[PDB]
Amino acid sequence: SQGTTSEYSKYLDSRRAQDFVQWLMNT
């Protein structure tokens, strides 16, 4: 997901960003 600034900032930071890259990769 693209998100909106502060919303995406979470999955651009630490743990959640790792889950997002793992996900993006699998997809």
UniProtKB/Swiss-Prot annotation:
Physiological role: Plays a key role in glucose metabolism and homeostasis. Regulates blood glucose by increasing gluconeogenesis and decreasing glycolysis. A counterregulatory hormone of insulin, raises plasma glucose levels in response to insulin-induced hypoglycemia. Plays an important role in initiating and maintaining hyperglycemic conditions in diabetes.
Protein source organism: Homo sapiens (Human)
Tissue: Secreted in the A cells of the islets of Langerhans.
Induction remark: Release is stimulated by hypoglycemia and inhibited by hyperglycemia, insulin, and somatostatin.
Residue stretches in coiled coil: none
Phosphoserine: modified positions: S1
Designated name of the protein: Glucagon
Organism phylogeny: Eukaryota, Metazoa, Chordata, Craniata, Vertebrata
